[PDB]
Point group: C2
Chain length 288, copies 2
Amino acid sequence: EPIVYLSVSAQEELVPLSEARVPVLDRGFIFGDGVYEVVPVYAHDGAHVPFRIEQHLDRLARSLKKIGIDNPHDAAGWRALIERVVAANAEGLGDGNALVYLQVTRGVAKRGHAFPANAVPTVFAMTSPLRLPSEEERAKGVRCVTAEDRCDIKSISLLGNVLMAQHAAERDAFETIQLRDENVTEGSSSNVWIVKNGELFAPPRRYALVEQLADECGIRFVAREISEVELRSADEIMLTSATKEILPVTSLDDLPVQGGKPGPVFAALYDAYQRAKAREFEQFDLTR
Amino acid sequence: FEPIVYLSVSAQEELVPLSEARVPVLDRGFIFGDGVYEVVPVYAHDGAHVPFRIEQHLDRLARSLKKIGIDNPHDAAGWRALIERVVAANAEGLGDGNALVYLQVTRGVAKRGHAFPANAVPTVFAMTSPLRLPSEEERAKGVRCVTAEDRDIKSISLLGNVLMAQHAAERDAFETIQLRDENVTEGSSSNVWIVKNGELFAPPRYALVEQLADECGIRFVAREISEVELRSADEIMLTSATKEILPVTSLDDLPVQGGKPGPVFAALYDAYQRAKAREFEQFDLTR
């Protein structure tokens, strides 16, 4: 059985794999909020010798810096941890090649996208046998296929969204509205709508609920690209999400949205949102 | 009041205090970010807690699971019952406040490998949390937003890489080489190199393969590699810490040139082994 190292909330253990478990609100589990590095450790003369250990640890330090996690160890500290985990697995590795897998996450906190204040990184390290490609694979070569490089789903690979939410928090902002090719896409955790001349717009697929609310109110809706210039000259801007319901945006990059007050299309859609709730409450009361 | 959460791992389920709820470290939600989530608002009304648009939320969940090839653990009724259960277990704690239910499904626990594991059993996690809706003042005054560009690092948000590794597996291939704007980017778990007229190329930003090239006298250039250039390359290679360097001799069922590994591969592979040899000799000397 693999013996692994795990440090969570500043407590560490070196345990059989079957005993190693992480809290469900670790941001590595909820948000994919972490980095990893793999160090090959080659069998040689009855020892296990890490390869390019300094370059790998330098890359890990750069990955951590890139996402704002303070490195939990200096180079000597990581080497010692690697040495420890390999030696604890000596019998299982035998004289075969191995790899050391290192993972660091932003740690455990209440679920929320931006960086939490009081978080201590989680560190996981394990070693497993490494089977290099065969003489035959090397002699014959391998087969590859091509595909288009890869959004439409709510996945838990959310490091992107985390960084955009942190981007907003750093600027004392509620949300980051993202642009691609001078067109509006979405917020880190919300959908974006605009109003011009009493009509409602969203980027091309919309969202059934808000479309239904617009319909109810007699407000025309069209999904089409919204340019950055159109966003900055909108009559209203709104955000929606399950947890935000619908909210007006009245300042954008520190400039006011039209007069800086919420507008009448926001007021109409917000009241319609509350009627949609009222109707579900009434259906609930009837069944009850 | 300690929140009570639901957890199902490797086909075993429990309803436990939050402080007791933990998942195996090799859960693919932890290692690869390989999973989806849904949030259902649960509003306080007349002493009860009433889910809002629960059918729409569960339909989205079902579609997302299907999209990434995870078997859906419940039908709509089953999900509604689980949600009802989790909320009732937390009744005392929610009081007369609004709440949300957070549902998360991952591909489950296996040996670390990017492609889908055989007979994997999905992990399910559900919890409640208080929901504080925006204030009357936030609604009255509105909120402040900023803008940024929508977008390099070895992260554990790897669901895209998983899907590209599985794409190769589905096709009995070793790796998927990705194209963007008809230029090569990278493999699901490797870097891609080509050779043309004895020169080595990689897409623009390995120090190691560049070192190996230099040792061999082989000119290296980082520049965009088009799909056309990839398909007509003299050699194609993949690199990673665990693959070292390997020759690609077939690409989408067409041979790479003659279909056999070429001389630049042979040179770089031997240089890779000399780099290992030197690290061993330095180790032996300090030992």
